[PDB]
Ligand binder design. Structure first.
Ligand SMILES: Nc1ncnc2c1ncn2[C@H]1C[C@H](O)[C@@H](COP(=O)(O)OP(=O)(O)OP(=O)(O)O)O1
Ligand SMILES: Nc1ncnc2c1ncn2[C@H]1C[C@H](O)[C@@H](COP(=O)(O)OP(=O)(O)OP(=O)(O)O)O1
Ligand SMILES: O=c1ccn([C@@H]2O[C@H](COP(=O)(O)OP(=O)(O)O)[C@@H](O)[C@H]2O)c(=O)[nH]1
Ligand SMILES: O=c1ccn([C@@H]2O[C@H](COP(=O)(O)OP(=O)(O)O)[C@@H](O)[C@H]2O)c(=O)[nH]1
Ligand SMILES: [Mg+2]
Ligand SMILES: [Mg+2]
Lengths: 615, 610
């Protein structure tokens, strides 16, 4: 089917009542009187579309005469595509698009739009029209830098971004300084200033490397640092670490600018991490090494840290804007409609590329970084619900293969578009010095799970000359936009099939739409209460097999099947993937370690685990 | 007696065992293995004397061919005055002078020094060569400026004490034309500063104006910010606030970037301040308005904060280096040796003024605000011990008249030294646009309790043409330097006559004027009861004279602060000590009196509080 026909099937469907509460809450614009400028999703769509379309001015391929009706093509498409809720950019894009712009340009009917209107939009974008979500900033070994980073966190947060850092440069607690001669506080201490800053500018990523002398104390640093997610950094190769472990080897903890040295059994270090994650979900693992392995600019540039949820490895001062396709709405008669998914990837990658052009950053080292690489994060949401529609159990193999294929297709046409764009609009500045140029068989992910592999290699070849973006794909958690879209989040399985929203306060008993659209209505009413008490189908009498096997939830799916699904997707994603490894209450410390080890033998770039009943 | 004879009396009097312990712990320079480069107070004195003498390199009135002689004469006068402990610069000067300078150079004999040697000292001063106690930084109403400020706190603290007025920060809940938000408030924002300092190894000043919407929350913000002293700012005239209180009127709380506004009874507010001070000692009162009244650069520059102990009111990015004279060493047969004192005062001013030129700051706008104003903080210590020798009770009008004359004489000669350095080296860049120039009869303290006033008036007039410094005087706490000097602290009475602190003292003047054996006898009781008051079979004359802090009532405390402040161009560190049984009304009563006197701030501590 044609995108245009699918759009016509979605465009007049309004968001549900649950999304609407969310929209009125933080998403509809409010004039300084506290009033409402937007009252319906449609309006937000109009605003965002118009503004993102605006980046077409900067297009060297357009002449004049043509430029107007042209931007009026992209605004309509972008518009149609977001009204349908077929593609949605990260929240920042939706809050801040067109802040600074005059209130009568943003919503006026399109065929009253003039060329000068779109130039005015371009110019009126103020210092809070920050349309991206992920940032990383460094924190060098120095006070001037430490406290400049605290300032940077604040400002990025003011504008609605999430940021992280590797703190491994900070010399250990106890070090010599002069300096001052007072002794170095250590990174775990300095992270308190980071924590305190954000407590007052109303989540962050904090990484320390496994070989830092203070690591043991970091692993323990939330037993506080309540605005931090913490992960343990592995900048060496995965294989190197897995080896050392299986030999019961020892690790040298040391730092360039100190004389503090220690040796620890790596198994014990892992046990310490495992226990704390077992206890409370922190810290995660970040396989920095593995991220660099696939980084076009490594070792010229370096990936040292992820943003708060791990899904973008970013170099210093680099940011990345994201958005996601609801693959659930591409379900056509037992198949994913590839003909409509392709056009939309085409459309989405241009949209996201356009965002960068209309974007404003609090710190122009970040503006620089961004213009230089133009790293995007096209992803998906609604995947679990799509598995539902296709009758594929999440925890299966079929599911992972399908996943790998879906992702592979998207990867393909996403990059083919970075191509057609690097042609039409000019290469991302740093192409030349990238592994796309000086390498040969450079692929920004592992592959090995799809037919599309060979076509992908070609394209990465056609990409030695034309390429708008260092990278293009990710899988975000989509905590909010999957809500807006009425669909499951990112690549996660549904946590529950049924729960109780309270109206604001009344029992509104929500059941998953697809469960409704498939399981018998009488059956449902019987089981409902029990489903909500147990949070799963599996132990419920008189529900057919077909259905318990298809409509699995996160806790129905064992840790390993989670891990392996993450692997399938990482194989065709250039950035990382946000994935919680859910573990049953009855899981042990050993169970966590085993997850960790498996993670080591797969192509996952990080690890988050969550034990049910932990916190 | 000439200063140089005075010097000969004290130069060989060894720092006491207690003083020497302190010197080792934190003043004697150590080499890069924790070995001792300095083992004697004399070494400190040499090093500091020489570094500061080096400033003479930049003297425009010396020809290149007299410089070496002049530089060495200053090192020598500085060295002697310091070894004798007649005058001592603020700790940072002790800690840091000479950092970055080859060792073979700091302590070498003066006879052997060349013009090149001084030049090598001047040019090898590193970024830790930070010689000032007191800083104030602005904290403007943006995320940008708030976190810049925090980084400055970090930086100053890493090398230094700092205060801010947080009043620019829109009230908690305010509209943020920035974004979705609601401004967090000055108080929460101050938590970032406390947290930064909890982590940078080196006390902080936090001020919020009485009429900022968050003042109530502020006043309670320590009923944490464990690193802050807090004060209420009164930017408006002291008279105006007294009137309001007497009329039982109301104060509007507002902020130029908020719609948050509220009315409060000034009395209930004051009583709340006082209630907390009564419990805990915080917050103090900072009479900003009264600091601006005497601020030569007002209204073009403005004073919004003090440093941590409140003794220097400073404009944005301004820093100030302190130094104190031990006035007890000036006692001579019933009198203060005013001849000797005047010479030291001239030296002490040049010394402090030279410290500027060899001082390195960690932020260029401080370098600039200091070069432009050249504010000094010459003060006194040993005042209480002096009174003992003079047989004058601290709690009497006799002491306070003595204090005013004493401080008036010092003020006199200091401003007169400032004229002379103005003439010899050049005026403080902003002389031309200050009230010493653009206004007649301007005086930067209230005067009014000395025969020296007239004389001070005309030195101020003369200072129309030449003036090296916008301001010269303070009275600092002198917590550590008065120990280095074996004397009493600032203008404070001795807190105790005999006491063990971490071991044993016993007041040296009391040792000297008390009948021994009937010291031995009573010594047990005094050491526990903490006063001579209720020990019998001790005069009387001794009882009257040898009073301690808790023997002196709060008004006698406060009026001594008044007496000195009439003759100090900056402010004054004085604790108004209250007995345990004092009441919240006794504290209000202090404040009311504070408002009538010429005091520039208030600190109260009730015995038994914390
Ligand atoms: N005063 C301090 N207290 C605690 N830690 C400090 C202090 N000053 C610096 N540190 C920590 C911060 C960094 O982790 C590290 C480097 O400090 P920095 O400000 O760079 O000193 P420096 O660079 O002048 O001396 P160094 O050459 O030793 O790095 O030590
Ligand atoms: N996200 C936030 N959380 C808490 N307080 C904030 C936040 N953002 C700003 N503030 C407070 C900090 C300052 O006191 C005040 C000013 O913020 P600031 O960054 O100056 O906004 P702005 O200058 O961009 O716009 P404006 O000054 O016109 O409101 O608001
Ligand atoms: O409340 C939030 C949620 C997310 N993020 C950041 O936005 C990224 C994308 O998260 P998600 O897709 O879950 O957010 P959404 O765009 O659906 O609101 C996260 O990894 C974080 O870097 C953030 O700063 N604040
Ligand atoms: O630990 C300290 C003690 C004092 N001061 C500063 O020095 C001023 C005066 O302190 P004092 O005279 O007691 O210090 P000393 O010169 O005796 O070391 C204070 O208000 C602060 O500005 C500081 O920065 N850190
Ligand atoms: Mg450094
Ligand atoms: Mg602002």
């Amino acid at each position: 089917m044609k995108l245009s026909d699918l759009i016509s099937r979605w465009i007049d469907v309004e968001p549900s009542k649950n999304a609407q509460i969310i929209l009125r809450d933080r998403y509809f614009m409010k004039d300084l009187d506290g009033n409402y400028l937007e009252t319906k999703w449609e309006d937000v769509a109009r605003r965002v579309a118009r503004v993102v379309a605006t980046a077409e001015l900067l297009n060297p391929s357009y002449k004049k005469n043509e430029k107007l009706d042209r931007i009026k093509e992209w605004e309509d498409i972008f518009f149609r595509v977001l009204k349908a809720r077929l593609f949605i950019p990260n929240s920042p894009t939706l809050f801040n698009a067109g802040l600074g712009v005059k209130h009568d340009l943003l919503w006026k009917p399109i065929d009253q739009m003039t060329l000068e209107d779109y130039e005015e939009i371009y110019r009126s974008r103020n210092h809070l029209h920050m349309l991206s979500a992920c940032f990383v900033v460094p924190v060098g070994d120095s006070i001037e830098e430490i406290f400049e980073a605290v300032k940077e966190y604040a400002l990025i947060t003011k504008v609605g971004g999430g940021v992280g850092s590797n703190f491994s440069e900070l010399r250990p607690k106890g070090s010599f300084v002069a300096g001052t001669h007072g002794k170095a506080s250590g990174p775990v201490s300095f992270m308190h200033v980071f924590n305190s800053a954000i407590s007052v500018v109303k989540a962050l990523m904090g990484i320390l490397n496994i070989n830092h002398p203070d690591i043991e104390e970091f692993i323990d640093a939330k037993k506080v640092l309540n605005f931090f997610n913490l992960s343990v950094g592995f900048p060496m190769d995965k294989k190197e670490i897995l080896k050392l472990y299986e030999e019961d080897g020892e690790l040298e903890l040391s730092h360039p600018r100190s004389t503090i040295r220690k040796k620890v059994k790596i198994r014990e270090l892992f046990r310490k991490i495992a226990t704390n994650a077992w206890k409370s979900g922190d810290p995660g693992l970040a396989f920095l090494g593995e991220m660099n392995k696939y980084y076009p600019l490594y070792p010229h540039r370096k990936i040292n840290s992820t943003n708060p949820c791990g899904e973008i490895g970013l170099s210093d001062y680099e940011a990345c804007n994201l958005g996601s396709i609801d693959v659930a709405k591409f379900y056509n008669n037992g198949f994913v409609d590839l003909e409509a998914l392709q056009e939309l990837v085409q459309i989405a990658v241009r949209f996201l590329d356009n965002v960068i052009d209309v974007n404003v950053f609090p710190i122009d080292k970040i503006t620089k970084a961004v213009k230089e690489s133009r790293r995007l994060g096209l992803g998906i949401m609604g995947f679990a619900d799509l598995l539902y529609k296709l009758e594929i159990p999440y925890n299966s193999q079929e599911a992972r293969d399908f996943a790998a294929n879906l992702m592979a297709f998207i990867a393909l046409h996403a990059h083919r578009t970075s191509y057609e764009l690097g042609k039409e609009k000019g290469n991302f500045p740093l192409l030349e010095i990238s592994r796309y140029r000086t390498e040969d068989n450079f692929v920004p992910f592992a592959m090995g799970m799809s037919n599309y592999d060979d076509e992908i290699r070609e394209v990465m070849k056609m990409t030695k000359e034309f390429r708008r973006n260092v990278a293009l794909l990710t899988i975000a958690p989509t905590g909010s936009i999957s809500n807006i879209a009425d669909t499951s989040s990112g690549l996660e399985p549904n946590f529950l099939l049924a729960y109780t929203r309270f109206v604001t306060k009344e029992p509104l008993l929500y059941v998953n739409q697809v469960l409704r659209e498939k399981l018998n209505p009488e059956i449902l009413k019987r089981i409902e209460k029990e489903l909500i008490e147990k949070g799963s189908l599996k132990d419920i009498p008189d529900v057919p097999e077909k259905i318990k096997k298809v409509f699995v939830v996160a806790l129905d799916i064992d840790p390993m099947d989670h891990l392996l699904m993450q692997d399938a997707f990482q194989r065709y994603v250039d950035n990382n993937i946000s994935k919680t490894i859910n573990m049953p209450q009855s899981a042990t410390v050993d169970d966590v370690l085993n997850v960790y080890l498996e993670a080591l033998r797969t192509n996952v770039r990080g690890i988050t685990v969550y034990r049910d009943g932990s916190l």
